[PDB]
Amino acid sequence: EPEPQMVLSPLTSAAIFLVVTIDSGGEDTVRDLLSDVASLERAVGFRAQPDGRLSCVTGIGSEAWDRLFSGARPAGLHPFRELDGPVHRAVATPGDLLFHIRASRLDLCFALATEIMGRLRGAVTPQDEVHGFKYFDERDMLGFVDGTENPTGAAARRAVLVGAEDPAFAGGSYAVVQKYLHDIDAWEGLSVEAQERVIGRRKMTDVELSDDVKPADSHVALTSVTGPDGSDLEILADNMPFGSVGREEFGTYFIGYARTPEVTETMLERMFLGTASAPHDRILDFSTAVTGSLFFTPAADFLEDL
Amino acid sequence: PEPQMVLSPLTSAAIFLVVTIDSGGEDTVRDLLSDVASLERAVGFRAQPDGRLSCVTGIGSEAWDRLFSGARPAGLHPFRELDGPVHRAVATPGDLLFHIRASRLDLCFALATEIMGRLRGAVTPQDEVHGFKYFDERDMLGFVDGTENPTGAAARRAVLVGAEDPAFAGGSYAVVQKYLHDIDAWEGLSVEAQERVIGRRKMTDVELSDDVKPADSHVALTSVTGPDGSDLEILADNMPFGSVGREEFGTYFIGYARTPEVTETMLERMFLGTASAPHDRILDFSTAVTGSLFFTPAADFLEDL
Amino acid sequence: PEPQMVLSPLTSAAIFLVVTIDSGGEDTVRDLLSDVASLERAVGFRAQPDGRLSCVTGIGSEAWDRLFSGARPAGLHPFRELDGPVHRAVATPGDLLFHIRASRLDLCFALATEIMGRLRGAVTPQDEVHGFKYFDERDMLGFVDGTENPTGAAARRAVLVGAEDPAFAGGSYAVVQKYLHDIDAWEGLSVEAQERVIGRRKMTDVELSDDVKPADSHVALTSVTGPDGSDLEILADNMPFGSVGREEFGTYFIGYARTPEVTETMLERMFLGTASAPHDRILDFSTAVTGSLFFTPAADFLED
Amino acid sequence: PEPQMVLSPLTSAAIFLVVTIDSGGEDTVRDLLSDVASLERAVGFRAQPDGRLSCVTGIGSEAWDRLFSGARPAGLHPFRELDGPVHRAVATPGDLLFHIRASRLDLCFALATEIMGRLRGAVTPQDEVHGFKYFDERDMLGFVDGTENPTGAAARRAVLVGAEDPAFAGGSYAVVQKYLHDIDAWEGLSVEAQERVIGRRKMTDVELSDDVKPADSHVALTSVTGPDGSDLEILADNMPFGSVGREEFGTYFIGYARTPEVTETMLERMFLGTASAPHDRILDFSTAVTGSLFFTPAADFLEDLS
Amino acid sequence: EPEPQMVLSPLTSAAIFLVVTIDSGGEDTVRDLLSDVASLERAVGFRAQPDGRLSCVTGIGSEAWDRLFSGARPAGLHPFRELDGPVHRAVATPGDLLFHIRASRLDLCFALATEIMGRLRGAVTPQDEVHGFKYFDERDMLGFVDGTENPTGAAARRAVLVGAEDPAFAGGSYAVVQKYLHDIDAWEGLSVEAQERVIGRRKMTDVELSDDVKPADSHVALTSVTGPDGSDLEILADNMPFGSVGREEFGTYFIGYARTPEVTETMLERMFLGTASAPHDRILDFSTAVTGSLFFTPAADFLEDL
Amino acid sequence: EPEPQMVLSPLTSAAIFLVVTIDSGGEDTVRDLLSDVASLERAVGFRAQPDGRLSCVTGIGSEAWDRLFSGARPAGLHPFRELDGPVHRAVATPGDLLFHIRASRLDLCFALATEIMGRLRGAVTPQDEVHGFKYFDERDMLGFVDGTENPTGAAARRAVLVGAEDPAFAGGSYAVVQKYLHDIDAWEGLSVEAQERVIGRRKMTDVELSDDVKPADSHVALTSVTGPDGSDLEILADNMPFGSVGREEFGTYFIGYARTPEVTETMLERMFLGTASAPHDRILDFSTAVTGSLFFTPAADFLEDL
Ligand code: HEM
Ligand code: HEM
Ligand code: HEM
Ligand code: HEM
Ligand code: HEM
């Protein structure tokens, strides 16, 4: 069987998101690093087992793929599509490589980020660097429990990993990233009941609102999609809070994994463009996307054999 | 008098916040100071016993005169710039220090958010650092950091104001300096050459014997004896910080002492040197870009405003 | 087919809830059954991954006919009362079982609260027990409890319905009995006499050799071999409970098996005895005050 | 003098046992009191260092007179019933309190078993509650509970008898009340209306500012200043308990203080009200079904008995 | 279908290695014990689950196999082959039975070793007993991280467990044991850079030296072997530090598991006999093997069906 | 004002006991190490803070004291007194220096023992080295809970630390060490009830037997001593299990700390020589002492000022 990267890691309490572009002539340096990134993950992580829980997921963008590799492309790989809604906009920003680094502690993430960027100095330009921290009770920046309905076990594998539909790339996945900044002052002006109507779940107990009370423009209602087969379309989301109190920056870094980008893209269309029953996702009245990129995260064996 | 949590254990995460008080900000600051222990309990209590959240609040010399009438702490003055032959210890603005520590960065951030929320419109941020200790108690240079800090009774005697300034008993003095490292130059040294810079073995943290420890090693220069033959001691809670994209690899220094004269004597030896040492060799790999001195009063002084 | 969490890791806290469905409560019950996996995730997620919260939902024989049309699980029937020469296994009412386990009682209680909140006006509570682990995985008799439970593939084979009843594959059968102990009489036995009752060493939990193990020891009577010479196995997740003021020192027994015939053969040996054993000596110190049988369907059955 | 473990580290489980001493049970009770520290060590030592087992033993006013022939603690009297215009604080029988705490209920239960085993035939049980920590130190109303308890030196000064009653130095006074909550009525309030009852924010546990905090909020009525302008403080170790089938959702209140006058002044404000407040709004959702006062002597007083 | 023993154990911090010979006439006692060893593992281990992580792996030597069992032998079972190199020697020492006992705590290991040796008294003679302990961040006595490049998951199963090539013994494995004593005085006279050239990795950070700088006689270069298909040949090594400061004994207990002994034997030949480019493994200039034995560790159900 | 060594350490799960003799001419090397032992303890221990709990207590024997130091001697310092009972003997064996090393993990103990013995090579000869481990719920090799009745807090300080009776040595303590080997075959031939009569406590529950059933020759009855003024004479005992399954060696390493050796020596006299009511301690019918040494453990500041 093809070995996937650690896409299906549990939630961790810390993360570093690194997005870079590949400079002209940086291709060979990048390929050498990609062939070593699993050995660097083991080097930093092994000595901190079993509590460290260090992993790195490496993704490659559409344009970068054509510069790095000859032969077949993954079927679903394309640049992130800008969404220009009546009120809210999902921007497309540059990114050739994603490093999604997770651990129980920020220092382990930083040590791996240092070894990776050390090997890439002179070959890449940093576009985004976010140090994420989950709150102690699994809450996000908005004060809600975050990750509850993520798939687990066999359902997660089926939702997230490329299989027989694209056999040369089996065990890969597609990652969409968006960095969101929140209007915390406007959010904290809402009553708890009004915040629950925005999300679609109870704030303290994390119980879903019943179908009779859940607004059609609630985050949970708009991101609930059924496929051709009547089954739920599922993604794995590993949202991380980040920020700077001095700059009044209060963010959620969104990363969503899926077997095809079509699922994530359908959810984004419903959020930003709306439906017959909803102008847009009410979460967007308190959240502005300032980045947007799509990456293919190949099977671990594809990176090793390069 | 109850001291603030100056004598906290080691924590793996910290936020350092330094702000200046804007024109007319005094009343807003006084209200927050009277509430900061209650905000620390509000954020921290629900995460006990693993959170280990604490906040130490410090006030600078100029800010003291704007906020309070009556007696000043005897040792409170602005940070003294040291302009050495090679290396310089700079002075930068700061009226208020918040030294926030916990087992996890999210608890530090949640307390920092409530504090800055109450101070919006009254202060200007000067510095914000999110610190993380390495899982083996190492700093950015790869050395174990904090080994010779005093503990128990020796720590109380070294750090807390007593009968020499009785109105301020239970207070302390904090010196902060943000350092940026030349990691490329440091990593070009052999481990043996790095051990000669610090004065300790890198892997095992055993002190070099007096016959091998260079006179210009960090441990040799920061070892000071008082007139009475006693070691002069401070409590240092150094925290790594950085940004890989910006190639920023730092150590945030904070040193607590019963009088600033001890910390200032250590800085003079590091920056100006001795008869036997031009300067602290750690400064050939470390540049100070901030410098501020604060008085951290007893907790009941802040509560009684 | 996805089973419920019948094969849960060891947990230190449990709530057992047994209710009857009132006349006209059927639709309220069906709506809750379709939601119970969502409620388990809602309560459990905020304590992940150390919470280990799970709920196993079971349905009784009589309740099954009131709730559903079409096929019944092949083994589902009311608990059979056993009237032995000395000891009796009583049958008591129960339409729904909630077997709630976690590493802490708060998670169990919060899930029990949401479930009973949805069922208010539709059900009558029959039994509620709050169980706790007692130091060294010990029970109220001071013996290690759970040692010989099957694990891995052997556990799946022993506990889950397969191809013998294909519409119900991934289901299981749960037998529950609440036991109260005579701790005064038990503590009057020497340790060596207690070891002869159970069939294992008290401190070290080593099985007694075949030459010394009495025929009427608990371990000898509950050891049954099937047609092929293989041991017939169940998964037992016994939990201590009690009230010191009322002198109630209990074991809540729950036994999971792929067919109730295995568990029922063990109960017959214990209560009725054999040619070699009058009855299980554990029953001279333990009185059953409840007895019910439930089918715990595959998770996908409850969702649709 | 060595105090009992009144100032215990944080624990997640408790058993509260209240018994009366039967006629002729005095000798059996005295023998047990002289042994209760040895029983605590016997059950607890084998589970060190994580068990954190302690037992605090309290004696009521009437029981004190039956057991001991010398001086009484200055503040010991039967619990004073408070008959308010709306709410009543009942006085119920209790001679002995066992306040048993640990990191796990098994240790509490095993110690309760050994104590009651020694007292069979000499006492009648009045009350038995098994308490548990609920999430992030919340009580059954969904609020964080314990936040403003004193710590360290301030706790010692607030809770332990000193030079004002020198024969009893190291002792304390415990008031117990078992409360049952009307959860249906409580859950009909908005979160903002709940916060006005308590005096703190529900999710974040931030105290309401003095300009918004109602005069009849729990935090406003239990905030008392003494003759010198200093705050009068108690140590409260509230524990949730209940039974979902019987719809019993409770708070077991125990308050420790150096003199019962502090706790009694707080109860008078709650139940009888002030010029500005009819009564504590928490009592519109909470009914006291027990009320007892106990003196918890220094450990060496119990050890030195016949 | 065949259940392997716990060859692929999670990470554990304590171990006992017991090697015994079977005395003349001890065969029947040994067969009875082998049929009971999984029941003894459950008896000691269950009460400490789930954090105890107690397991025992039982191995049988080539000569003992012929004394105990009639019928088929595992295809790869033979006595350990002595290697007489120009400088360094890998000695063969007697051993009929291996007990590889691991747990999170030494007490569980010791209690299981006690029950096993209790059943075997008068049937076996102990040859070697070592109590191993985890040393800081997974370091060995040379101060290097040890275990980094072990296979995990499916790759570990494929490398370690017998499959269809020897179908009667599927789910078995081969264990090679060597007890090594280190010359710590000579090792600590090397600079860290000279130590890194011996191992082939950075000491503090555990990053592999690049192919241009890694010496051909480094430990990592000599133990890196490719098979006929260009794939790396892998083993599972679970090295444990041990020692006695008073006797200046600073040791590594090596145990290597593989699906066939030919892989481990090829690594030993390269270390002891060298290649065209390396006289021998430089680690052997600081490490002396004082035992050497090979065992077959059968599937669990082979032992149970005695 | 004098700082004691960590005689009153929290509970630890691992220990190394090192006893050495000082070779002719080794005095100066020993004095240098004594002045550095607190610095070595911090160097090894800091990197594992705060859960490591590493401490070293250094003791000096009577003969060694006279070789190392001039002037006043601790008032109670003498060689261990051999006890020649009618049946049982307490042997005196050589030992000049004791290192009593404790931590939550063996690796910290071992690393500190290595640094100490490294500094002492050529100046000392090892006499005894034992690696101790916690055995289940604080049990010893006889299956009984061990340490239950040790004093704690202020009572422990008063029992263990030299004060005004020997003011030049205030803050010191006296340690008696005896290595015991158990006859486990003889012990396992007793019923549990017969074992309980040997110890004087219940085996599973660790409840003391009542005064009406506790035999006069039980361990608990013989080690219970009152002084002329009615107060209990107390020691701090920190017994550690050790052993080797292959050698059938099952031991208890006894170390007892007291403010004067007269207390410990009175307990040993009652055990070995007996009383009017008891021939000897019945624990000695299953336990043989194979070492016996007495050391003075000075105040930390005494060692630092060399
Ligand atoms: C500001 C950014 C976001 C925040 C703070 C956020 C937060 C949340 C929260 C609190 C929940 C409820 C608990 C849970 O199931 O995890 C949720 C559910 C979910 N979110 Fe988001 N979200 C964000 C952006 C997105 C985006 C961009 C997507 C899709 C492209 C997305 C997809 C989902 C999905 C699919 C669910 C699960 C719905 C269900 O089946 O119940 N989220 N989110
Ligand atoms: C610039 C970055 C700095 C770094 C990375 C650093 C790092 C270290 C390290 C690794 C040690 C040895 C372990 C220990 O005892 O903690 C140490 C010791 C010490 N440092 Fe620093 N340090 C820095 C700045 C300073 C400053 C600014 C002062 C005083 C003003 C200072 C005072 C000391 C003292 C007093 C010791 C203990 C010396 C002794 O053994 O007595 N350090 N430092
Ligand atoms: C008062 C109620 C009960 C108590 C206190 C109790 C206690 C125990 C104990 C201490 C063991 C030995 C350790 C272990 O393997 O778990 C055991 C084993 C066992 N019990 Fe029970 N038990 C009770 C009721 C039952 C019931 C009602 C059944 C079956 C219907 C049952 C079936 C078994 C089985 C099958 C074993 C494993 C036998 C073997 O293969 O070794 N038990 N029980
Ligand atoms: C149903 C019964 C009760 C409940 C649910 C309850 C709950 C709470 C809560 C949520 C708080 C705020 C957080 C904190 O500081 O602990 C609080 C504070 C407090 N409660 Fe209660 N309480 C109850 C009864 C009592 C009683 C009977 C007394 C005293 C006789 C009392 C005295 C206090 C005090 C002194 C405070 C702290 C006020 C301050 O200084 O901020 N409580 N309680
Ligand atoms: C003195 C005894 C030994 C010591 C101290 C030792 C230490 C190490 C160290 C530090 C590494 C690097 C980290 C790692 O991947 O584990 C390593 C790797 C390895 N060792 Fe050893 N080892 C010893 C004996 C052996 C023996 C006898 C064999 C084989 C028969 C062996 C096979 C290996 C293998 C296959 C690797 C992984 C190489 C790679 O692909 O990266 N070692 N060992």
Residue numbers in the entry:
A (entry chain B), E (entry chain C), F (entry chain A): 7 to 312
B (entry chain E): 8 to 312
C (entry chain D): 8 to 311
D (entry chain F): 8 to 313
Please give me the paper's original passages concerning this structure.
Using an X-ray free electron laser (XFEL), we have previously determined room-temperature (RT) serial femtosecond crystallography (SFX) structures of the ferric and Compound I redox states of DtpB,26 a B-type member of the dye-decolorizing peroxidase (DyP) family. Such an approach results in “pristine” DtpB structures that do not exhibit the effects of X-ray-generated radiation damage. The RT-SFX DtpB ferric and Compound I structures revealed that the distal heme pocket, which is composed of an Asp–Arg–Asn triad, was void of H2O molecules. DtpB, therefore, represents an exemplar of a His–heme-ligated peroxidase in which the distal heme pocket favors a dry site. By disrupting the distal heme pocket Asp–Asn–Arg triad in DtpB, our RT-SFX structures reveal that a wet site can be formed.
To assess whether disruption of the Asp–Arg–Asn triad in DtpB leads to a wet distal heme pocket, microcrystals of each variant in the Fe(III)–heme state were produced and subjected to RT-SFX crystallography using a high viscosity extruder sample delivery system at the SACLA XFEL beamline BL2 EH3. For all variants, well-defined electron density peaks were present in the distal heme pocket, consistent with the presence of resident H2O molecules. In the N245A variant, only one resident H2O is found, and in the R243A variant, four resident H2O molecules are observed, with three of these accommodated within the distal pocket and the fourth positioned in the space vacated by the Arg243 side chain. This arrangement enables w1 to be directly linked through a H-bonding network to bulk H2O (wb in Figure 1). In the D152A, D152A/N245A, and R243 variants, w1 is positioned close enough to the heme–Fe(III) to be a bonding interaction (average Fe(III)–OH2 distances within the DtpB hexamer assembly of 2.52, 2.83, and 2.28 Å, respectively). Site-directed mutagenesis has revealed that distal Arg243, and not Asp152, facilitates proton movement on H2O2 binding to Fe(III)–heme, promoting the heterolysis of the O–O bond. We have previously reported that the distal heme pocket Arg243 and not Asp152 modulates the kinetics of Compound I formation upon mixing H2O2 with DtpB.
